[PDB]
Every structure is written in structure tokens, then in C-alpha cells.
């Protein structure tokens, strides 16, 4: 019938199906997954061994 | 040759070799994954925090 | 003779936390969130193994 059992979320999207499960879990600002993705993007090459590129040692080969 | 040759050197050949970059070398270790404090909580109850 | 039994589901959990400045500093051993998650998973695995 008429759109009486209709609702919208905080972002302006409307759901017209009373039996459709609405998405949830949007109230946790600064989500941990977002923080992990941000760390992966803004800080690449973290934990890499670059000590070899500033070594003045003429011998770069390890032998017994 | 009445003395030893290089064929009698065993432990020196077997130990793995790594390259050093200073007179002091540092490394980190992992000891535990957390203290033993029980892992059962119940329905709709926030579990306790842990650290390594 | 016949019988009818019942089993009850139980819940396990743990919580991991990381402070904000720890996420900003330059840290070795790679990403910190992944390390904490791996530690939590291994601790839960040990707890499940002993509870079994």
C-alpha cells in the first residue's frame, strides 16, 4: 500500500522493504578496520631492512 | 703436513652467517601471548582485555 | 528404552586494545593491529585447546 512502513538512515538512503534487514554497526566512529587500512596506506615499507643501503662497508658478501 | 687441514673444521661451516652493521646489534623477542585469566564471558557481556 | 538429550551453547571471547599514539609512531615488525590480532587468535586457540 502507501509508504507508511518506510524509513531512512543517517546518509539519506531509503528502504521500502519491511522484511529487508537494514545494515548496522555504523555508530562506531574510527573503526579498527579503518585504522588498519589507513596504516597500510599512509605508512608503506614499514618494517623493511634498509640498513644495507647506508653501509660504507666495501664488503657486502658474507663468507665463512 | 703433520698438522690439521681445513677438512677438520666443522662447527664454523655449519653455523648460519648474518651481516652486522654496527658494534652493537639489537633484536626483539616475543615471550607470551597474554596472561591466563579465563575466556568465558556469557551472552551480551564485554570480555576482559589482554596484552602480550 | 529411548532417551532425548540436550546440549547448551557456550561463549568465548577476548579483547585487544591499542592506544592512538602507538598507531602513529614508526614501529618495527610491521603493522601493529595485525600483530595484536594474531596474538589474540593464538591465545584463544590455546584456551580452546585446554577447555576441550
Amino acid at each position: 500500500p502507501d509508504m507508511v512502513l518506510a524509513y531512512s538512515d543517517e546518509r539519506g538512503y531509503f528502504i521500502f522493504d519491511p522484511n529487508e534487514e537494514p545494515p548496522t554497526g555504523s555508530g562506531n566512529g574510527e573503526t579498527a578496520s579503518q585504522v588498519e587500512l589507513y596504516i597500510d596506506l599512509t605508512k608503506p615499507l614499514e618494517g623493511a631492512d634498509f640498513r644495507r643501503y647506508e653501509s660504507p662497508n666495501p664488503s657486502t658478501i658474507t663468507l665463512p | 703436513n703433520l698438522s690439521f687441514t681445513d677438512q677438520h673444521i666443522k662447527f664454523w661451516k655449519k653455523i648460519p652467517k648474518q651481516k652486522a652493521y654496527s658494534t652493537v646489534e639489537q633484536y626483539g623477542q616475543l615471550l607470551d601471548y597474554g596472561r591466563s585469566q579465563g575466556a568465558f564471558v556469557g551472552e551480551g557481556v564485554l570480555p576482559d582485555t589482554n596484552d602480550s | 528404552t529411548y532417551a532425548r538429550k540436550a546440549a547448551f551453547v557456550k561463549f568465548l571471547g577476548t579483547t585487544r586494545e591499542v592506544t592512538h599514539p602507538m598507531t602513529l609512531v614508526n614501529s618495527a615488525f610491521g603493522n601493529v593491529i595485525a600483530r595484536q590480532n594474531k596474538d589474540g587468535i593464538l591465545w584463544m586457540l590455546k584456551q580452546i585447546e585446554q577447555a576441550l
Partner: peptide, 29 residues
């Protein structure tokens, strides 16, 4: 002469030991 030394505490580095950066293995054992 200028020597590197075997000093760990950063606040006690003197002479040639003040030129040394830390050498940290990137693998967690």
C-alpha cells in the same frame, strides 16, 4: 683515535660512539 665502543645507553655516548645509529633486526623472534 675515534672509537665506536660498546655503550648501549644513548645518554652516555661519547667520542666516536655518538656517530652510531642503532642496528635493529626487523624480525620478531
Amino acid at each position: 683515535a675515534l672509537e665506536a665502543g660498546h655503550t648501549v645507553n644513548p645518554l652516555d655516548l661519547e667520542g666516536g660512539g655518538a656517530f652510531r645509529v642503532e642496528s635493529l633486526e626487523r624480525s620478531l623472534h
